[PDB]
């Protein structure tokens, strides 16, 4: 359950990671299949704007 976090702060739901690449600054980017969109809308996003979420367990 992945999400992209915008500069605005908002969270956008990710269907899946399509691909991965290293950028010119040596940092990882992921090709994002956005939930509700098709492959023509896939975009490369920086790793540090991606989040993984899980059901809350009081642990």
């Amino acid at each position: 359950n992945l999400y992209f976090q915008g500069a605005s702060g908002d969270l956008y739901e990710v269907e899946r990671i399509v691909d991965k690449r290293k950028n010119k600054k040596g940092k990882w980017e992921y090709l994002i299949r956005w939930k509700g969109y098709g492959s023509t809308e896939d975009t490369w996003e920086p790793e540090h704007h991606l989040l993984h979420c899980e059901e809350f367990i009081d642990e």
Partner: peptide
């Protein structure tokens, strides 16, 4: 990008 996405934002908004």
């Amino acid at each position: 990008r996405k934002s908004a």
